[PDB]
Ligand binder design. Sequence first.
Ligand SMILES: CC[C@@H](C)n1ncn(-c2ccc(N3CCN(c4ccc(OC[C@H]5CO[C@](Cn6cncn6)(c6ccc(Cl)cc6Cl)O5)cc4)CC3)cc2)c1=O
Ligand code: HEM
Length: 526
Amino acid sequence: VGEALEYVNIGLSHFLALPLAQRISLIIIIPFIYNIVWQLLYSLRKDRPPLVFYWIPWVGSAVVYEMKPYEFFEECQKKYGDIFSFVLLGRVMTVYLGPKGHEFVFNAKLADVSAEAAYAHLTTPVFGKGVIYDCPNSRLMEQKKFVKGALTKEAFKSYVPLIAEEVYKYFRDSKNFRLNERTTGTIDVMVTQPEMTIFTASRSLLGKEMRAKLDTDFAYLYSDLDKGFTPINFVFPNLPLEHYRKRDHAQKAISGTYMSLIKERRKNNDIQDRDLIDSLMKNSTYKDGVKMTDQEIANLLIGVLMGGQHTSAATSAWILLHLAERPDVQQELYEEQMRVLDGGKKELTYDLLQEMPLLNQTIKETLRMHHPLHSLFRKVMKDMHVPNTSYVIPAGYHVLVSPGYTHLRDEYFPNAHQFNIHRWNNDSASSYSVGEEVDYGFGAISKGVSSPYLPFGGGRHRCIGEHFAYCQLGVLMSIFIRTLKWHYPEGKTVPPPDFTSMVTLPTGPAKIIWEKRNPEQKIGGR
Ligand SMILES: CC[C@@H](C)n1ncn(-c2ccc(N3CCN(c4ccc(OC[C@H]5CO[C@](Cn6cncn6)(c6ccc(Cl)cc6Cl)O5)cc4)CC3)cc2)c1=O
Ligand code: HEM
C-alpha cells in the first residue's frame, strides 16, 4: 500500500514529463472521456429528465438545436417524451414540450425562475442600462405598464392613418416599388418588410421627428444597432471587434437623439399625447416614486422599437410569402376589403380593421405557422419539482418552452403544416383568455397559459405588443391587398425558416413579383 502511494507520486511526475505533444493530446482527450462517463452516470439518476447524448463537451447539442430546433424537439420527444434536457454552449437546457410545458415555465413562480438572468446579455448591450432585463422584475412590470399606456384603442385610431401614409409613401418613393412609374416588379421581402416596418413603427410610436431622421445618414446608426441584435450575444456580448463598437456607438447616438427630443419637448412644455415619447414623459414614475431617467426612457424606447421591429417584419414577410402561392386567399381578402371599405370609398380606420376577420385570421394563421421566437427560456433559480413526475430541475439549469413547436402539431391543429386562414373562422381575435385573469402589474391577462396557441407567451413576461402588431400588420396588409397582386418567380415557393437569427425569419433571398391591380392609379404627395 505505502509502496503504491509512492508510485502514485511517481506517476504524477512522469505525467508532467510527457512530451508537449502527448500532454496537449491528453489535455483534450481527458475531458472528452470524462464527459462521456459523466453522461452515462447521469442517465442513472431518476430525479433528472433524460439528457440528450452529445460528443463535444461545453458545445453540447448546439449545432442541431440552432439549425432545426423543431426537428430536434420532435426526435427528442419520440425518444424521451415531453420533458428532456440538452447541453447548449455551457448551459443545461430543460425542455418541456406542449401546453403543460407552457404552464410549467410561463406560469412558474417569480422566485423559481429568472427571465432577466436568461436574456440580459441578449438585450442590455443593445438597448442600454436600467431597463427591460437590466433591472428587477418589478421594474420591468411597471415599464410594461408605462409602454402599454401609449398602446390604447385611442392611440391605434390615431396611428392607423399615420401607418397608412407611410405605406403609401413607401409604395410611391421606394426603389422597390415606385408605383407611379412602374406597374410590376420584383422585390426581396427581407429587404422591403424591415424598411416598411421601421418606417411605420417610427412614425407612429416615436413620432415625426424620429421618422424624419431615417431619411438621413442617421438611418445607418439603426443599421449598426440592428446588427448588434444577434444570438451571438448569448455567448459573446462584448468582444473588441468593430462590430461591437458600432453597436455601442449606435446605442449612444440613438439614445442621445431620443434624449435630445425629450429634453426639448420639456424645455418647451411641448408634451402632448402624440406618440410613445410623450406618453413616457408623462407617465414613467414607479410606484415607489422613483422616476425613470431620460436615459432609461430612451433605452426603453430602443428596446420596444427593436422588439417590435424584428417580430413584425418577419411576420409580414411570411404573410406575403404564403399569400404569393395563394391567389385564392388574396382574392378572398380583396373581396373583404371591398365589402368593408365600400369598394375603397371608405378610409381605413382602426374600427374598420376590426371588421376585417379574414385579414386578421391571416395574421393569426401566419403567427401559428411562423412563431417568431422558436424558444423562450428562463434560468432556474431554485430547484423545481416537475408535477406528476419524480424529476427535479436543479437551480442553475435553464428551462425552455416552445409554443411555436406546439403550433405545428397535428394533434392541436389538424393538418398543421397547411396554411389555412379558415381554421380561425369566427375566432379572429389576436388572442383571448378562456377563463380567469390575473394582473402582474401591467394589466389583467389570462391566468392560464395552457392554450396550444400562444404566439405572445403568457404569465408575467407576456407580450404587450400584440395589439400594436395587429394594427401595424393589419394596415400594411390591407393596403398591400387593395393595391397589388403578387406571385412567385417560376418554380419558387415558401422558403424554410432561418432558425439561427434572433427571430425565425424566412431564408433569403425570398423574392416575389408584384403587379398593380390598377396600373393607372397614382399616389399623390410631393
Ligand atoms: C453564431 C454564434 C453561435 C455561437 N451561437 N451561439 C448561440 N447561438 C444561438 C442561440 C440561441 C438561438 N435562438 C434561441 C434564442 N433566441 C431568442 C430567444 C428569446 C428572445 O427574446 C425573448 C425576449 C427578449 O427579446 C424580446 C423579443 N421580443 C418579444 N416581442 C418583441 N420582441 C424582447 C422583449 C421586450 C423588449 Cl422591450 C424587447 C425585446 Cl427584443 O423578448 C430572442 C431571441 C432565438 C434564437 C439561436 C442561436 C448561436 O447562433
Ligand atoms: C407578431 C408580433 C409579436 C410576437 C409574436 C411577440 C411575441 C412575444 C413573446 C412570446 C413574448 C414573451 C417572451 C418570453 O416569455 O420569454 C413577448 C414579450 C414582450 N414583447 Fe412581444 N411579440 C410581438 C410583437 C411585439 C411588439 C410589436 C412589441 C412592442 C410594441 C413587443 C413588446 C414586448 C414586450 C415589452 C414584452 C415583455 C417581455 C418581458 O416581460 O420579459 N412585442 N413578445
